[PDB]
Symmetry: C2
Subunit: 681 residues, 2 copies
């Protein structure tokens, strides 16, 4: 195989508002002959071309001849754009040197089509809404008004809608990931075994998964259950290490998670029912005769989980576990804790805060065993309304809070917030005895889509645990893949500007995705549907922010370089010191949040080495290869510092700074930004 | 596994495990597991064999 020509281009990068970056073209000859090659670029009015070599053409080169061919351009649009360049060799031009054959094969002219991405100005976000219309052989309609424009940015706000009932899950690329006994700290054993348990339910039920690896996961669990035998308490409770703390209770998330799968896993190796009923009588002894018991919870415990330590939600955690054992007075006990939860549910009905984490998981499952849970099918709609989500996930930002207290969507819990929410939400969806064809099924299919789209089994997710929990969603949907859905649904999408696009859904459009956008600055979405069964349609309004925002209590102490380039060798190598700590770190969840990215045309080499070196008393040495993660440590203020440099990939650049800031410390206050750009420019 | 054992010594000793859970701690789990073992063997109607 051989070709006497090839193109080396400039992969620009997700680039900045100033679109004048550097773009060149370098065509090189490997055949020993000299050949002329005319060159031009197929352009369009979508961007503002500026000719550098306006008057003279990059003309003619020979064997191993080097020529840079670059132009200037300052586009107006945003998004993926492909530049179509062409280069052709002609005949009868023996004047560059002595001779030009210029007779190639059917690959006559050289052309390249380079899709370059451009990042819009400022920081990107959205604000979606959630809407449900389900007539029973009739018609229901609603209006959605989409307006929150404070401190707008020019030409960023757009939107779209969709609805789905997806079947046809792709494949199993990401189901393969592994970890082992913590070399560093045994405290991580809790977050080890908490997800490894339900791998039992994932072997056959998927039909796509690789059950070899979960069959090995149960091999690890054959030691895990002995660790639990060693992590138990004599009285019946559980902790990180076990007994010698007698008169006290322990966390119930992991024991409630694991007791049902000990009941399903008492087949391979025998665990007696004594081990279940001792935990049970431990659950039974703590209940008062009249009162909803007190339980002071240690909040921000890195070993166990990150939460809010609301003792009533723990009183509900015991009872989701009680719901399994078929004792029939146990169900009156879960009714008592359901009255405590009814306190919590009125707190939810106010719609201000119930921590948005726990009752979500428990309300469905408590009644999903019984079979009269249409009330819970109704509250799961309210759970679905509580999300600023992508088409399948949540990314970053609650809309425009005037109200100070918000429960849990942009807390220091930062596994990107989509997985640990959507997982328990799907657990809530499809535990139903009756045919769940109604909106819960459709939303479950909405969740499964991006889970199937994750075609990377790395394990270097935005988080580190939650890739384990993401495989709950695809897996439990394996049995729910069989259903009956598709009706005389005729959807109508209208807005103020005399526009009306019609849509329809059936059993063959059950899996069809409808994407349609509108560019109007007003936002209004009146809908009208028909048919039978209940299905949920979703919105998404993408828009950038942060042209220039004020300073705020957070202290991102970033230092770029010694105050300027002011020299011919700078603008390439300059180490950026960052020293950061929000003093607010009190009792939310393990240190999870960080974002640090590269500005447009700068590549990291040594930063990787430094981060590999960094460790603050405890560490996971997690990485993204454009970011850095050394944060997981105990409750402490008193920041540290660093320095990391780059190299110049972009020779020329227009003026606007790139910035990489995520910031979540407490809910009452403003979310506390702090910034400083790059001075060399 | 699927068989019972003599009850003279366990019946003799369970009450004094309840009296002897003061010096060194035996949990009530150890009592109630023997108890549920005593409870599982009873038929609904018959005097078990
Ligand atoms: C540009 O390239 C992208 C990425 O493959 C592709 O999706 C798009 O269709 C291309 N546009 C064309 C053909 O100009
Ligand atoms: C395997 O999983 C399927 C659902 O995917 C379920 O219907 C079946 O009962 C499971 N076990 C068997 C019998 O194959
Ligand atoms: C934070 O700084 C304070 C300063 O008084 C210090 O007492 C504390 O140990 C530091 N870490 C914690 C516990 O937040």
């Amino acid at each position: 195989a051989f070709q006497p020509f090839f193109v080396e281009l400039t992969m620009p990068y997700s680039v900045i508002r100033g679109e004048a970056f550097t773009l060149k073209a370098t065509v090189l000859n490997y055949l020993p002959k000299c050949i002329r090659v005319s060159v031009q670029l197929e352009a369009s009015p979508a961007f503002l071309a500026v000719p550098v070599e306006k008057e003279q053409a990059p003309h003619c080169i020979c064997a191993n001849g080097r020529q840079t061919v670059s132009w200037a351009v300052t586009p107006k649009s945003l998004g993926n754009v492909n530049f179509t360049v062409s280069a052709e060799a002609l005949e009868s031009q023996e004047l560059c040197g002595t001779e030009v054959p210029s007779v190639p094969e059917h690959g006559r002219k050289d052309t390249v089509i380079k899709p370059l991405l451009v990042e819009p100005e400022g920081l990107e976000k959205e604000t979606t809404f959630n809407s449900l219309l389900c007539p029973s052989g009739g018609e229901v309609s609603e209006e959605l008004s989409l307006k929150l424009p404070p401190n707008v940015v020019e030409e960023s706000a757009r939107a779209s809608v969709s609805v789905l009932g997806d079947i046809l899950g792709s494949a199993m690329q990401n189901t393969q990931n592994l970890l082992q006994m913590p070399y560093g700290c045994g405290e991580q054993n809790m977050v080890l075994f908490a997800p490894n348990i339900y791998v039992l339910d994932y072997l056959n039920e998927t039909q796509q998964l690789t059950p070899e690896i979960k069959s090995k996961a149960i091999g690890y669990l054959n030691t895990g259950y002995q660790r639990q035998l060693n992590y138990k308490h004599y009285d019946g409770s559980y902790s990180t290490f076990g007994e010698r703390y007698g008169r006290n209770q322990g966390n119930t998330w992991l024991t409630a998670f694991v007791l049902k799968t000990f009941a399903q896993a008492r087949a391979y190796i025998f665990i007696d029912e004594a081990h279940i009923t001792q935990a049970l009588i431990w659950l039974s002894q703590r209940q008062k005769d009249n009162g909803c018991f007190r339980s002071s919870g240690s909040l921000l415990n890195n070993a166990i989980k990150g939460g809010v330590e609301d003792e009533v939600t723990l009183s509900a955690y015991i009872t989701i576990a009680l719901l399994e054992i078929p004792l029939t007075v146990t169900h009156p006990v879960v009714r008592n804790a359901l009255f405590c939860l009814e306190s919590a549910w009125k707190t939810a009905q106010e719609g201000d805060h119930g921590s948005h984490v726990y009752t979500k998981a428990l309300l469905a499952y408590a009644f999903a065993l019984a079979g009269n849970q249409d009330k819970r099918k109704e509250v799961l709609k309210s759970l679905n309304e509580e999300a600023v989500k992508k088409d399948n996930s949540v990314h970053w930002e609650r809309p425009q809070k005037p109200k100070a207290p918000v429960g849990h969507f942009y807390e220091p819990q930062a596994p990107s917030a989509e997985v640990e929410m959507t997982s328990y939400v799907l657990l809530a969806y499809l535990t139903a005895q009756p045919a769940p064809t109604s909106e819960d099924l459709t939303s479950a299919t909405n969740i499964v889509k991006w889970i199937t789209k994750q075609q990377n089994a790395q394990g270097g997710f935005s988080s580190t645990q939650d890739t384990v929990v993401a495989l709950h969603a695809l897996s439990k949907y394996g049995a729910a893949t069989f259903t009956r859905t598709g009706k005389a649904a005729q959807v109508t999408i209208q807005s103020s500007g005399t526009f009306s696009s019609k849509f329809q859904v059936d059993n063959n459009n059950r899996l069809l995705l409808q994407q349609v956008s509108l560019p109007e600055l007003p936002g209004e979405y009146s809908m009208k549907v028909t048919g039978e069964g209940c299905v949920y349609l979703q919105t998404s309004l993408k828009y950038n922010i942060l042209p220039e925002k004020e300073e705020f209590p957070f202290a991102l102490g970033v230092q770029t370089l010694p105050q300027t380039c002011d020299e011919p060798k700078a603008h390439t190598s300059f180490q950026i010191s960052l020293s950061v700590s929000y003093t607010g770190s009190r009792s939310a969840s393990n240190m999870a949040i960080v974002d640090v990215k590269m500005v447009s045309g700068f590549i990291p080499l040594k930063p990787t080495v430094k981060m590999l070196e960094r460790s603050n008393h405890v560490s996971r040495t997690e990485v993204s290869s454009n970011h850095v993660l050394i944060y997981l440590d105990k409750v402490s203020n008193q920041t540290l510092s660093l320095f990391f440099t780059v190299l110049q990939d972009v020779p020329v650049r227009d003026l606007k700074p790139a910035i990489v800031k995520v910031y979540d410390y407490y809910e009452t206050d403003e979310f506390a930004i702090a910034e400083y750009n790059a001075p060399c420019s």
